[PDB]
Subunit: 375 residues, 5 copies
Amino acid sequence: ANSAKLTAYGTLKSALEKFQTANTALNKADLFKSTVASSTTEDLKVSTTAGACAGTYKINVTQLAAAQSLATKTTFATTKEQLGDTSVTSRTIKIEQPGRKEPLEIKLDKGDTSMEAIRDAINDADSGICASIVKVKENEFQLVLTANSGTDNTMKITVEGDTKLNDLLAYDSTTNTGNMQELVKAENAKLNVNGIDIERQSNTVTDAPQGITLTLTKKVTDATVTVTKDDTKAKEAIKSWVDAYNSLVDTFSSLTKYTAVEPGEEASDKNGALLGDSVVRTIQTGIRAQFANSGSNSAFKTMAEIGITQDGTSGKLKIDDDKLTKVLKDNTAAARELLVGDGKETGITTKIATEVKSYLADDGIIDNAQDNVNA
Amino acid sequence: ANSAKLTAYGTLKSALEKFQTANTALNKADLFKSTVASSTTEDLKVSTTAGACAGTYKINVTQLAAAQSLATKTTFATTKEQLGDTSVTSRTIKIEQPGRKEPLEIKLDKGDTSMEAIRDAINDADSGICASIVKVKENEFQLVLTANSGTDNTMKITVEGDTKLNDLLAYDSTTNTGNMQELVKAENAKLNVNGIDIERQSNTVTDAPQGITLTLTKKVTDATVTVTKDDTKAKEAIKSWVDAYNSLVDTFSSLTKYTAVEPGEEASDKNGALLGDSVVRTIQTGIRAQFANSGSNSAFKTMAEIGITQDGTSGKLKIDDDKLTKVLKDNTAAARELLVGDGKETGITTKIATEVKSYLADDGIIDNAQDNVNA
Amino acid sequence: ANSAKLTAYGTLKSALEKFQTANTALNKADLFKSTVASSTTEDLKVSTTAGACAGTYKINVTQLAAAQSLATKTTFATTKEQLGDTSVTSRTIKIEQPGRKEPLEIKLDKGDTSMEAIRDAINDADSGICASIVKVKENEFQLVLTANSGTDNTMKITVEGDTKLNDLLAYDSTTNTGNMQELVKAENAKLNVNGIDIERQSNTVTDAPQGITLTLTKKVTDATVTVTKDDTKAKEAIKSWVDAYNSLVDTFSSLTKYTAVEPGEEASDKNGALLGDSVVRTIQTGIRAQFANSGSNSAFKTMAEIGITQDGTSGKLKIDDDKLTKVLKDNTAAARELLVGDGKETGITTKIATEVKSYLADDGIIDNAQDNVNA
Amino acid sequence: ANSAKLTAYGTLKSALEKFQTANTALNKADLFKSTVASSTTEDLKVSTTAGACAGTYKINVTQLAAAQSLATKTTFATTKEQLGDTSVTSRTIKIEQPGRKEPLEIKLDKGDTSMEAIRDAINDADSGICASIVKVKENEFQLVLTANSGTDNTMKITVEGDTKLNDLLAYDSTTNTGNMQELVKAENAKLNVNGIDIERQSNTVTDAPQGITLTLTKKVTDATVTVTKDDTKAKEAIKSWVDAYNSLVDTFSSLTKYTAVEPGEEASDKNGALLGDSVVRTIQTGIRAQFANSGSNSAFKTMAEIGITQDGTSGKLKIDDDKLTKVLKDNTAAARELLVGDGKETGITTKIATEVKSYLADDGIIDNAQDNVNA
Amino acid sequence: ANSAKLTAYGTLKSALEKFQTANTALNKADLFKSTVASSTTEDLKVSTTAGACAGTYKINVTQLAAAQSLATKTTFATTKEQLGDTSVTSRTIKIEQPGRKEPLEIKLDKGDTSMEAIRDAINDADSGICASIVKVKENEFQLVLTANSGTDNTMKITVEGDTKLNDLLAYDSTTNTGNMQELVKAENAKLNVNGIDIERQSNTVTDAPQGITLTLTKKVTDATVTVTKDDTKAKEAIKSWVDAYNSLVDTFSSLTKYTAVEPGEEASDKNGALLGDSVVRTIQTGIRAQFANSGSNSAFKTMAEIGITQDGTSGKLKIDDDKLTKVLKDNTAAARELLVGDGKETGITTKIATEVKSYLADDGIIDNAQDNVNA
C-alpha cells in the first residue's frame, strides 16, 4: 500500500524535474530577439546572435589584418648546428609588445642554441609569438618568428647573457632597426557599415552593429548584408515547453488516475496512488494560475488569446500553430514581455521558473512531504 | 448481437469522418488554378500561388527599397554613462511617421538615460523603429535608430520634459534638420513588368500581375520569368480523394459483408452487422448519384468520362491516369467546372461535399439512427 | 487428386499471364532505335525519343516566341467598381483569332461589369486567352488579357450589346487600332540546325530532325548537340524478358516436377500435377522451336549466336552479357530485325508474342483444356 | 562414417574452387600497371587503363571531327507522297565510300518511293549512313542522309533502274556534284600531345601515348593532363586474395580439426573428417612451397619481407598494410615480377595458379582420390 | 571458486590491455600542435600536419616542375619490326643522371630490338625512366622515354655492343646532342611564401614553412593561405581516453563489486572475485595519484582544474566540456605540458603511460600474480 505511494511520489518527482529542466531551457530570453543574416558575396561572412537591428547594411571591407613575422639575416647548414656560445650556461630572450602588461622572457640553456631548440622554447612560451623553420633549399635554413594580428603586437627583441644570440635575434620595432629582418608587417582591419567606420585589430569584427559579427576573408565592396527577424527557434522552444507540460500533466493524471469499480470489489492496481493529494492539487492550481497571467503589460494576458488551449480530460495543451505563428510574427515585444518581461516578477516563463524552483526548493512543500512520509 | 451492431455503427462513423476530412481537403479549389514559375537569374525570386496568367514576363528591377537609419552626433565613453538629466523623474520621446495614425510615445525614467536603457526602451516600443549601439573603437560609442522600408516611414523625433535628451535625439525629417545625423535614407522599390511600371514600399512586390509575388535581391535587367500551368498537386489531390473513397467503400462493404452459410447454421461473426440498413443504402445511392453530375456547365457530364471507374465487387475506384491527365491538361476550366463549378450548387466536389455534410450534419439521418439505437 | 490438378492449372495460368505481360512489354520496338543527346550550354534543352540520326548538330536559336498581351488605357479605383452599363441585362464579347476556326464569344450579365467578373469569365473561356489584374499602386488597377505564343494567335476584340464595355475592351489587331493597348507583341521561334532553318510557333521545336525535340530558354550560338546510340533500355528489356522466361520455365518445371519414389509407395505431393499433359508439352515445344527463328532476314538465326543459352536441367536462360552487349553495339539494325523485323510474321519478339497470344487466345488450346477439365 | 568423409571431400573441393577463382581473378597483371589521370579543363576527357607513362601532357585540341550529311534540293508536301516512278517494280541505290571494301546497295520496291520508306530502308542498311526527315514548316519536308566521322566516309550516291529517284538522290563527293546538297562537311580530328601531332578520324583519340584515351568535346589550349601511378586496385586485389587464402586455410583446418578426448571416450563429432589425409597435406605443402618463391629475379623473395605473415594456429595470413603499401609504392616493377614476372615460369601468382590448376584439373590428385573412393 | 578467480583475473587483464591501448593511442603528442589550413584559390592545395605557425601566407607559384621526355627521330612501320642488329646476341643501354649514384644499365637480347621489347625492358628497369609508344597515324610509330621532375634528372643515353641501336637511342643531355629528340624539357618549381623564395624539384613543396605542404596545380598569384589552431582531434582523443578510463574503472568495480546479503546466506555470484586484491588497489591508487600529478610546470597542477571530475560511486569521469574547450583554446602549451611535457619524466599522459606499462610489463605485479596463481 505505502510502497505504491512511494513509487508514485518518485515518479511525480521525476516528472517535475523533467518539467523544470524544460522550463529552465525556455527561461533564457535571447531566443525572442533572434535574427538571421545573409550576404550577396561569399567572401564576407556574417553571424548574428541577438540584439541585431533587422535591416540592410552596405559593408565595405577596406582592409584586412596582417600579423608581423620576422626572419634571421643568415642562412645555416642545418637545424642542429649551434647558433650561440657553448661556454655560457644560460641566457635570456626578452620580447616587448605594446599590447602586453609585462615583457616576455625566455630562458635558454647551455647547449640549446640550435634553431630547433630556440623554436621549441619560443613556441612553448605561448604568448602570441610562434616560431618556425624555413628550408629555402638544400644546406639552407632560416628562423621565422611571428606575432598576432594588430599594430598593438609589434615586438622588440633583445638578448641578455649572450652576445652571439643577441647578434642574431635582436630587433627593435619602434626604431625599425635590428638583426632580424621583417617578412610581414602588421596592419589593422578597417571597414564601413551603414556610413559608420569601424576599426579592429583582427579580422573578426564584432560590434559594428552591436550583435552582428563579421568575418573578413576578402576585400569586398558594397556587399549587402540583410538581417531579418526569426522565431523558428522561439516557436520550437514554445512547443517543447508545451509538450513538456503535457507530459507532466499526463503523469499527474496517471498518478491520480481512478478506475470505477463495482461495490464490494477489490481495489484495482490501475488506480493511481496519488489520489486526493494536497501537494498535487496545490501545484496544479499554482500552474493553472500561472496559465492566466496577471500583472503583465502585454496586450494578450493568456495563451488562450495566443492560441494554446488545455483539454480538461487529457490535460495536454493543444497549440494553434498558425495563430501562434501569427501572434509571434506580428508583435514580438508583446509576447516577449508576456513570457519574459522584466525577468524578476512579471513574465510567464520567469514566474513559472520561480514557482517551480520554490516547489523544488529545499524545505519546500516537496521536501516537507518527503520528510513527513519518511517519518 | 447488439454490441456488434454498435461496433459496426462506430466503424462506419469513423470511416465517414475520414472520408469527410478527405473531401473537405479536396474542397479547396484554388489548386486547379495552380501555376509554377522560374527565372533566368538567381537574383530575382518568384513565387506563384493562384490566379497567375501563364506566360513570359520581362521583369526589370530598377530599384530596391532602403530603410532610414539615424545616429547621434556625439561619441561617448561607454553604454552605462548617463546621457540626460538625473534630476528629472520622467520624460517623453515622440516619433512622428506619415504611415502611422497616431504618434509613438516612449516614457523614460529618472536614472535610465544610458544608451543601453534608451535602446531597450525603443526596441520595446515595437512600432517600426529599432535601436542599436555602435562601437567605433575603444572608448567610442554611438546610438543608431532605424525605421522600416518606404518613404512613408521617415520619422521626426522630439523630446518632452528633458532638454539634454532633446539636445541629443531630436530630428526633423520634413525639414531635414535635427540633432542626430542620417545614415541610411529611405527609398521606394520600382520595377517594370511586361511594360507596366510597378512601385512598392518594401522589396516584396506582390501585385504586378495579381497572383505573382517577386523578391528583389539585386537589380536585374530583362530577366525572363516564365509561368506555366501545373496540375501535379491537382492530380495528387484527385488520387488522394479517390483512394479515400476506396477506403470508405471498402469499410462499407466490410460492414455490409455477408458470407454464404448453410441453412440453419449460426450467424457468422464475419458477417457485417450493417446488413439491410436503410441509412447505408441511402448514403451510397446518394453518393453514386452525385457521381452522375447534373446541372453542370462542363462539357463532360460524368466523372466516368474522365477515366475513373468503380469496380462492382470491390467498390473501390480505379483511375485511368493517362486519360485523367489528358483531360486536365487539355481543358482545365472544363474539369474545374465539372468538379467545382460556381461552388454553391454545381460541381462534383461541391455537390459531394454538400451531400456528405448533410449526411453527417447534426439531426441528420446518422444522428437519428444513433438516437433510435440508443433509445 | 483433382484439386491438385486444378491448383497446378491455375498456377500455370498465372505464370503464363505474367510471361505474356512481360513479352508484351518487350514487344514495342521504339527501344531499339533509342538515342541519348547532350548539349554544351545549359540554355538549350534537348530530348530524344526515337528515329534520331546520331551525330552532331550546330543549333543556333536566333529567336524565341512571344505571346501577345493587351491592357486597358484607363486605371480605376478598385476591382469591384463597375466598368459598363447597369441597365443592360446581358452583352457579348467577341474575340477573333486567325488560328481558330470559330470566334470566341463570352456572355456577360447585368451587374457583372467588374474587373474581377470580366477576368473570371475570360479565364473561364479557356480558349487561349487569360485575364489578370495589375495593381500599379494604391487606387490604381488595370485589366490585362494575354494570348498564346505565335503570330497565329493575335486577337481582335469587339463587344455587342454594350457601348461602354465596347469603349473599354475593343481592339483590332489587323489594323493595329483599338481601345486597349499592346503590352507584349507576338513573334515566332526561329532556329538553325545543321544548315536547315526551322520556324515554329512556340519555343518547343520538335521536328528539326524528326525525332529530336528542342527547348529554347535563351538565344544560343553554335551550341553543339551530340546524339549517340543507346541500348541500356534495350539491354534491360532483354534481361527482363530473359528473367521472365526463366521464371515461367521454373514454374513449368515445378508443375512438371517428378520425385523418384520406391515402388509401391504413395504418390508424393511434391510431384507436379501437370505431368504428361498435351497442352503443356505443346506449349513448351512451341517455345523451344521459336527459340531459334525461322524466316528471319538477319544474319544471326538464334540467340545462341548472340549469347543467351538455356540451361538443360533448370531450363532458365543464362546471358553472356559481354557478348550480348557486343552484338547490340556492333550491329543494331540486324539485332532489331532479328527481334522485331517487319512486325507481322518475322522478328523473334513479334512472332513469339503472336504464338503466346494464340496459346492464350479465346477458344485456344488453353481455353479448350480449361473447358474440358471443367466439363 | 563414409558419409562424413564424402561431405568433407565436397567441402574441401568447394573451398579449393573458390580459392582457385580468387587466384584467377588475381592472375591478370594489368592491375600492377595502373594509372590515374586528370585534367584542368572540363572539356577534355581522359581515360587511362594501362601502359601509361606517368607524367604531364600539354594537350591542344586543334580540331574536332565532323561527319558528312546531305539533303535533297526539293521540299515536298508530306512524307507519304511518292518521290519516284510507280511503274517500276524495283530499283537499286548505290553508295560508295573510300573506307568500305564493297559498295552499299539498297533495294527499293514498287510503291515505296515515300520519304518514310526510303528513310526506313536506309536506316535498315546499317552501314554508316543514317536517314532522317526535316519539317521546315507546314507543307514542307526534306530528306537528310548522314555518314560517320572522318574523311574516309565521304559518300557518292547513284541509282540504277529509276530516273526520278536518280534525279533526286544522286551525289558525287569526288567531283562535288550531285542532286542532293551538302549540309555538314567531313573533317578529321587533330591534336598535339607533348610536342607530337596526332590525327584521328573520330573524336576518341586512343594512342597519342599508347595507353591513354582522350575525348574531345571542345577545342582546348594548353590543357595539362597529369597521370600518376596507382595501386589501390592492386592493394585491394592483394587483400582479396589474402582473405581468400585465409578462408581456404580456415576451411582446411576445420576439416582437419581435432579435439582432444579422454581415454576410453567416444569420438567427438566436432573432429574434422580430413584428419591425416595425403591429398590435404600434399596440397598445403605445395602452397607453402609456393609461398617461399624460387627463381624470381625480384629483390624480395617472400611476402614475409613484404609484410604478410601466416599465423600457425589459425593458418590465416595477416597483412602489414603500411609495409605492403610502402613496398608497392617504392618499387612497382619488383613486386610485379615477384607476383607475375614473365607470366610463364616465374612469378608467385603465376606459379600458384599453375599449381592450383594442376591440383584441381582432371586426373589430378582430387580426381584420383574421388575415383578411388568410387571404386 | 578458483575458476571465478581466474575468470576475474582474465577480465581484469583484458580491461587493462584495452586501457593501455587507448592510453598509448593518446601518447602521441603532435595532436596538440594541430592546425588547419585553407586557401582562397582552388588551384593551390594545402596540407598541415604539425609544427605549423598559425597565420597568413601570401603564396605565389611562379613556376611548376616539368620532367624531361625524349623521342626518336625516325617513324617505323609497326611495333614488332626490328630496330637493331639480329646477329648481336646481347647489348647494353646506359643512362646517366646527375641525381643517381651509379648509372643505369639495361641488357637487351638478340631478337628483342622491337619498340615493344625496348619499352617493356626500360619500364621494367624502374629507375625513374618510363617508356611509351606513340601512334602518330597509320603506319607510323615513335618511341618516347621520360624522366622524373627536376633538373637533377636530365639523362644521357648511350649503347654498348650495338651500332644501330646506338644510332637510335644515343642522347647527350650535357651537350644537347643526340640521336633522339627532346619533347619536354626539365624545370624546377619556384614559389614565394611570406617574402621567402622557395625552390624545389617536384611540385610538392613541403618545407616553405616547415610543417605546411603545398601542391602546385596552377600558377597562382597572391593566394592567401590561412592556418589556424585546431583541437577537435585533441578534444576527441581526450574524451576517448576519458571514456576508456571510465570503462576500465567500471570493469574494476564489477570485478570488485560486493552485494549486501543477510548473515549466513550463500555467497552471491554477482560479487566480484577480485575483492580485497593488492594488485587492484595498488594500480588504482597509482593511477589516481597520476591524476594528482607532481613535477609538472603547467599552471594547472591537476586535471580536475581542467574540468574532468571522477564520481566516487560510479568511478567514471565526467567532463566539463565547455571548461575543457576553454582551457585548450586559451593556453595550448600549458595543457600540452600538463599532459605531455618533455615526454620522459613529466606529463600526465607520460606518467600514466609509464605506470600502466610497468603494471603490464613482463615480470611485473600482474605477471607475478599469474605465476603465483598458476603455481
